[PDB]
Structure formats: C-alpha cells, structure tokens
UniProtKB/Swiss-Prot annotation:
Catalytic activity reported: Hydrolysis of proteins with specificity similar to that of pepsin A, prefers hydrophobic residues at P1 and P1', but does not cleave 14-Ala-|-Leu-15 in the B chain of insulin or Z-Glu-Tyr. Clots milk
Protein's recorded name: Endothiapepsin
Full-protein residues shown: 90 to 419 of 419
Catalytic residues identified in the record: 35, 199
Transmembrane segments: none
Gene Ontology BP, a term: proteolysis
Gene that this sequence comes from: EAPA
Keywords, sorted A to Z: Aspartyl protease, Disulfide bond, Hydrolase, Protease, Signal, Zymogen
Enzyme class, spelled out: hydrolase
Disulphide connectivity of cysteines: 255-290
EC numbers for this chain: 3.4.23.22
Example of a GO MF term: aspartic-type endopeptidase activity
Domain called Peptidase A1: residue spans: 17-328
Family indicated by similarity: Belongs to the peptidase A1 family.
Amino acid sequence: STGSATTTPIDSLDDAYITPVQIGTPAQTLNLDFDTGSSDLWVFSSETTASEVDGQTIYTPSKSTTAKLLSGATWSISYGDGSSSSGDVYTDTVSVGGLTVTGQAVESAKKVSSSFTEDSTIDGLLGLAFSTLNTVSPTQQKTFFDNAKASLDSPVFTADLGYHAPGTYNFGFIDTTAYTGSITYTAVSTKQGFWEWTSTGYAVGSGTFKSTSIDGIADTGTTLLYLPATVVSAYWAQVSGAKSSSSVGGYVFPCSATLPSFTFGVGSARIVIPGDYIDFGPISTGSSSCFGGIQSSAGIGINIFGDVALKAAFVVFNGATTPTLGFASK
C-alpha cells in the first residue's frame, strides 16, 4: 500500500504545516502537525477542557463506531518549546492520504498548554519519530508509520515541505518526479529515538564550505534551524546589523536586509537553503527588526534540522531494519 497527502503551511511564515488525517468511522478529519521529532498521535477532542479549545476541530470518540477506549492508558508529553498536553487513549482507524491503519492509538487530550489553545489551525500532532519515544503508559504505543510499515510497498515515508506553499507527505514510495539529481543517503542513530544524523559541514552564502561534523535531528515539527553557536555566529556575521538579542530570544536582523543562503552537507552532497527561507519577519507587528530562521542550539542540547532546512530538500525517512535518511535537492 501507499499514501499521499498534501501538507499546508499554517500561516504566511511557514511556522508549521498541517496535513488532513481521517480518524474514526464515519471519518472525522482533523488537521495534524506531522512531527518527525516526537512519537505520539494526539488530538484535540470532546474530552479536552472546554476553556482550552479555541477554534480547533475535535475528535469525538463516542461518534466513531470503531473507537475503543484503551483501558488504563494515559499519556503526557512536553515539547522542546515548553508546550505540553496529556490525556487518555483510544484505538481507532486512522487514514492519511489513502493509507489506512486499524487499531492506531489516538491519544485524546484532556489538557493542552496555552500555545496549543492559541493556535486554532493545529488540531493535534502525528508523531513520526521512533516508537521508543511514545509516552503512553503503562503500555507504550506505536506510531502511525510503525503500524503501517509492514503493509507499505517500501518501508519509507518522505517529507517535501514547501516554502510559502503546500507540499507533500508520501508513505510507502519515493516519487522520483519530486526532486532533482540523486538522493544522498546518510546514517541514522536511533539511540535517542530521533532521526539523528551527522551533517558533513556548512557554507554561508557564496563562501567556502567548512568540513565539520554536525550531529542533529531531522525534525519536521520544529520551525527553525538550530545549530552550534559557532556556525550561527558565522552566518549572522554576514548580515549587516544582525545581532543576538537576549530580550527577543535569538538573532534578529534589519528587515531591510537581503539574507545570504546557507548550505549544509549530506555526505559529499550539498543542500542550499535560500536566504529568503531564513526570514521570519518582524519580531512584533510593524517592527523593522526581523527574526532569524537560523538560531543557536546552545541552550537545547541537540542540533535541530527543522523546517527551514528540511523545506529546501526532498527528505526520505527510510524505516528499513537499519534506518537511514536521504536528502535530495528539488
């Protein structure tokens, strides 16, 4: 089997991407944030504290003839941005782009933190990291991809995120029309539960490539590109007036600037992020200070190849017995 679904930016900055997902019988369609950096499929629901719902579409398990309470199971998750959610668990039928999994754990939120409530466009998350990170207790649950894998024509999914435009998540096949050149595959460590890999270096603008190993994670659920402070300083030094602002929380730059590109290495291959992809707009409405799309990971503990990086590539998440990642230009 295969599946193919369009993913759409939630706003004009590409802060996140939403993909329609059918849950239950009859189908209830929710727009979920596909997140290769976590492993829980959770949704706003009829169980979510009412004051914490503000415009999201909810899953109502009592209206699904295939929903079953997973007795005794609870979940609770905290994300790197400080947001969180928790609740109980149902199993139900879940379909993405024509690919159907029966018995998928659908984690129903009883509580969500303020950032989730405040974002009316995201009805929940669909985790695509390794199932070892799934938070369901006392019986850990499998991701949608893990449950689908055996049925897929090939045990892969691909992320093709757009810049200020829709893109595609495919399951079970590699669309050879969706990228240019060849796909370069690189090794993955699953030891932390992430799609963790090692970039071979970087360049800023038309500058020379610096060969250096950068371990990080391919994370569709993180907006920006978080890299070591040395790399980030070298990038922003090429932008007149750019500075790191403790009060804003990262590098800012004059909105009048034209940003240089940023290149990252995948083996001997190179992925070029155009400068425009690194502009996240005014820090507050009407400001002439703009927020940068490349930020230091120094306070995180891990480097994160988020959407800024991934949207410059066609990315293969290869879930073969030994997982690997593939990157192609597009």
